[PDB]
Amino acid sequence: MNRLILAMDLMNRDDALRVTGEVREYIDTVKIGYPLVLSEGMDIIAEFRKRFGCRIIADFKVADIPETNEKICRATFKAGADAIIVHGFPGADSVRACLNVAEEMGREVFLLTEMSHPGAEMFIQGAADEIARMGVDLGVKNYVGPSTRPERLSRLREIIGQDSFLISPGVGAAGGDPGETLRFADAIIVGRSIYLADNPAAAAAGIIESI
Amino acid sequence: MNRLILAMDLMNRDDALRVTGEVREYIDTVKIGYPLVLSEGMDIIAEFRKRFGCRIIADFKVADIPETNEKICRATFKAGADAIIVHGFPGADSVRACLNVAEEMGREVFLLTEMSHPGAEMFIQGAADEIARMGVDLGVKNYVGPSTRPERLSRLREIIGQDSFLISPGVGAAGGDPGETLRFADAIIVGRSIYLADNPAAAAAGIIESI
Ligand SMILES: O=c1cnn([C@@H]2O[C@H](COP(=O)(O)O)[C@@H](O)[C@H]2O)c(=O)[nH]1
Ligand SMILES: O=c1cnn([C@@H]2O[C@H](COP(=O)(O)O)[C@@H](O)[C@H]2O)c(=O)[nH]1
């Protein structure tokens, strides 16, 4: 909805529920990561899904060996997540393990190819095109790419095709622009610009109207 | 969305996709049953979920022995359904088997307590209150009750409490009224009044505005 995904990284349940409820009319998809899950428990995923009737993407940056990745994905989907974000840099076998569980459980894998922060230029950027091509070869249809580098987002879009779904973080606080990012991504992920705002609903409304 | 769930019982993929796309702005939840699945395959569930970004309730009226019920639910959730409708009349063990799989896969079970058609008065109605109480005892939080008998829907709402989620079919073609049904149910299910209409979008819009 509105091509906007809320990155809910507040660490306490009450604040997370308050902000998510305030901006629900503008979204239908919430990205929940370890900051909230490690503080309040995996049960928070089912609670959000039920209370807000939104889709939940678990941003767990899965980056282990195949066998452990299988275990992490199974627990995550058992908890009710609709999709999970997985790193591609640990290799194809590690990604395939995630895809196997998603297939078994009727869920989806998002492949993270290039990250949005400054440090991403050190090692990830140099491998990003190859990671995206690996995703295509494995049948991945959902990807994550950087708002902070639209030229890289364009290159990623080029590799994955127009039929793949691409979401992009780094919007707002990290420097990314909503409109420019949406020239290439299907949806933008926004965390701090909304959840640290004095009026999260007004902040979400502003982003939606700017695009 | 709009407390309206589309019962997509057309049997061919092209017509089903056309009508669902035409009314998508009014809904966010589609009920898919055997008329469409047995004609086009279980893969239609993932296709709808992806193409329309809606939640999918599989109306499979699960009504077998525990072991078979477990198999049916597993295949259904593997196919991507968010929830499954199960009959309560075959007993508690049969329902528990469904709840066990839903727990394993992070999904939901809707318990059907009293049906909406005339024949429901023969045997189901007499057992309906006990079936609803069984659901409460088993921890069921989602229920299906009849639009065609609001006094029975009221009795069912009484047993399950205000915190349980109740959806109700029999609206329109079978005689049920949207507004009266919503006095007790959280959402109404509508099939033919929308999918056989000359203008499904206008029909959906009319129902939404009447409530
Ligand atoms: O390359 C990536 C991948 N993931 N995220 C995540 O997306 C969200 C962005 O939040 P922000 O809007 O507050 O910067 C956070 O949950 C963060 O972990 C990034 O920021 N960059
Ligand atoms: O008690 C019940 C349970 N399920 N349904 C189902 O709900 C839908 C109602 O469709 P309709 O609006 O076309 O009558 C159909 O898929 C039907 O199998 C009923 O009608 N009554």
Swiss-Prot record, chains A, B:
One matching Pfam family: OMPdecase
UniProt keyword list: Decarboxylase, Lyase, Pyrimidine biosynthesis
SMART domains for the chain: OMPdecase
Domain of life, per lineage: Archaea
Binding sites annotated in the UniProt record for substrate: 9, 31, 59-68, 116, 169-179, 191-192
Transmembrane segments: none
InterPro entries in the cross-refs: Aldolase_TIM (IPR013785), OMPdecase (IPR014732), OMPdecase_arc (IPR047595), OMPdecase_AS (IPR018089), OMPdeCOase_dom (IPR001754), RibuloseP-bd_barrel (IPR011060)
Pathway: Pyrimidine metabolism; UMP biosynthesis via de novo pathway; UMP from orotate: step 2/2
GO MF annotations in UniProt: orotidine-5'-phosphate decarboxylase activity
BP terms from Gene Ontology: 'de novo' pyrimidine nucleobase biosynthetic process; 'de novo' UMP biosynthetic process
Catalytic activity: orotidine 5'-phosphate + H(+) = UMP + CO2
Active site: 61
GO cellular component: cytosol
Family to which the UniProt record says this protein belongs: Belongs to the OMP decarboxylase family. Type 1 subfamily.
Known function: Catalyzes the decarboxylation of orotidine 5'-monophosphate (OMP) to uridine 5'-monophosphate (UMP).
Record's subunit section: Homodimer.
Protein's name according to its UniProt entry: Orotidine 5'-phosphate decarboxylase
Species of provenance: Methanothermobacter thermautotrophicus (strain ATCC 29096 / DSM 1053 / JCM 10044 / NBRC 100330 / Delta H)
Organism lineage: Archaea, Methanobacteriati, Methanobacteriota, Methanomada group, Methanobacteria
